[PDB]
């Protein structure tokens, strides 16, 4: 079908969306592990603002805890809990 | 706490809603302001079972969305613009 103008604009406006984030980037100091999965689904600010001078940034944040399998090759393999940053509220602010 | 199996299943390579910048998809449309300037498209994302593999589209389709175009000082109107979606993803080597 055709997505109507007002529908597209509401659905694309600045708000938290599920975003797949690479576990190694959120933890650059864990160089020695393989993670499974290697990325996690987190709420992060996405979408656009009403003009090019604004950007979508978080104004409220929380943490969520997920079970991630760590493997260090030849040594061991186990699951455990890791914490990740989420965005709960977003605002359009100047850059 | 999110359990291992659920995190793994939700994070594995599949089409996920993704906010795509309209000018990036239409770099010829140079003089316009677009409203909204991005659209939500199903695009591949997520991870693969090991670092040698990357997530990539295998089946694609188009979606038509009404987008407002503004050339500042000249005019303003809406019309239809077509965008590429991903329907199926596969993990393949890099």
């Amino acid at each position, epitope marked *: 079908e055709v997505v109507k103008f007002m529908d597209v604009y509401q659905r694309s406006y600045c708000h938290p969306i599920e975003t797949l984030v690479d576990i190694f980037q959120e933890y650059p100091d864990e160089i020695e*592990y393989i993670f*499974k999965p290697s990325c996690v689904p987190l709420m992060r600010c996405g979408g656009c603002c009403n003009d090019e001078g604004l950007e979508c940034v978080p104004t409220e944040e929380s943490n969520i805890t997920m079970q991630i*399998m*760590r*493997i*260090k090759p*030849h*040594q*061991g*393999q*186990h*699951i*455990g*809990e890791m914490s990740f940053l989420q965005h709960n509220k977003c605002e359009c602010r100047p850059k | 706490v999110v359990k*291992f*199996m659920d995190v793994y299943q939700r994070s594995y390579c599949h089409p996920i809603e993704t906010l795509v910048d309209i000018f990036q998809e239409y770099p010829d449309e140079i003089e316009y302001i677009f409203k909204p300037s991005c659209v939500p498209l199903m695009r591949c994302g997520g991870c693969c079972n090991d670092e040698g593999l990357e997530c990539v589209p295998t089946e694609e389709s188009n979606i038509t969305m009404q987008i407002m175009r503004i050339k500042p000082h000249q005019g303003q109107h809406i019309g239809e613009m077509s965008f590429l979606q991903h329907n199926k993803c596969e993990c393949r080597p890099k």
Partner: antibody, heavy 123, light 108 residues
């Protein structure tokens, strides 16, 4: 409750072979590596190696590589240790022991053990 | 293979005495050292991991210290049920290796 129950110990002739089995219960077998450890009568502890229960990949201490084989049956949540060319010095209680839940960093200690199963190399 | 030497090999102490057991590594292992207690006829039981982290469920009278190549397991007040063989274990490099054991008898 998390329990490891081994079985398969018994008499085996010098130069023979047998399979030991370590049935897990009370947790997800695929989420923690399984270690094998043996103790000869009156003696110390000896790490044989371990196996990745999610992928199936084994890792052997060197002295054990030629005669000891690891394998899995994830549907029955069981780890196997197969041994051949056996000798008197392999008479021992053989343990399986699972790796732990981690909290901060990864620490490779042995969390829960089986009761052990005794292999006696004799005619 | 890293060689873990424990001393003494056995010791005898009264109820209430402070008991200390040392582990020596053939090369630096950082703090990658665990301690186990093995009672007659049972599988070993982890007491401490990562040099000094008391495993949950283990009396606080067990504690560990050290680093590099020298490690100590301490029993601040020896109890009749601490009769056991105590082993150290490094996990700095595979294969994992154990010290030879320390037998703790109770004097009465």
């Amino acid at each position: 409750e998390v329990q490891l129950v081994e079985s398969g110990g018994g008499l085996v002739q010098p130069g023979g072979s047998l399979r030991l089995s370590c049935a897990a219960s009370g947790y997800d077998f695929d989420n923690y590596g399984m270690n094998w450890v043996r103790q000869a009568p009156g003696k110390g502890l000896e790490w044989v190696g371990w196996i990745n229960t999610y992928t199936g990949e084994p890792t052997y201490a060197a002295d054990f590589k030629r005669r000891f084989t690891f394998s899995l049956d994830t549907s029955k949540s069981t780890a196997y240790l197969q041994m051949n060319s056996l000798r008197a010095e392999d008479t021992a209680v053989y343990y399986c022991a699972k790796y732990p839940h981690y909290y901060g960093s990864s620490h490779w200690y042995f969390d829960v053990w089986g009761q052990g199963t005794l292999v006696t190399v004799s005619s | 293979d890293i060689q873990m030497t424990q001393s003494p090999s056995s010791l005898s102490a009264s109820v209430g005495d402070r008991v200390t057991i040392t582990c020596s590594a053939s090369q630096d292992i950082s703090n990658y050292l665990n301690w186990y207690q093995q009672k007659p006829g049972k599988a070993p039981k982890v007491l401490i991991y990562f040099t000094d982290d008391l495993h949950s469920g283990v009396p606080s009278r067990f504690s560990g210290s050290g680093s590099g190549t020298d490690f100590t397991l301490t029993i601040s007040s020896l109890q009749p049920e601490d009769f056991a063989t105590y082993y150290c274990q490094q996990y700095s490099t595979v294969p994992w290796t154990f010290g030879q054991g320390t037998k703790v008898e109770i004097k009465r």
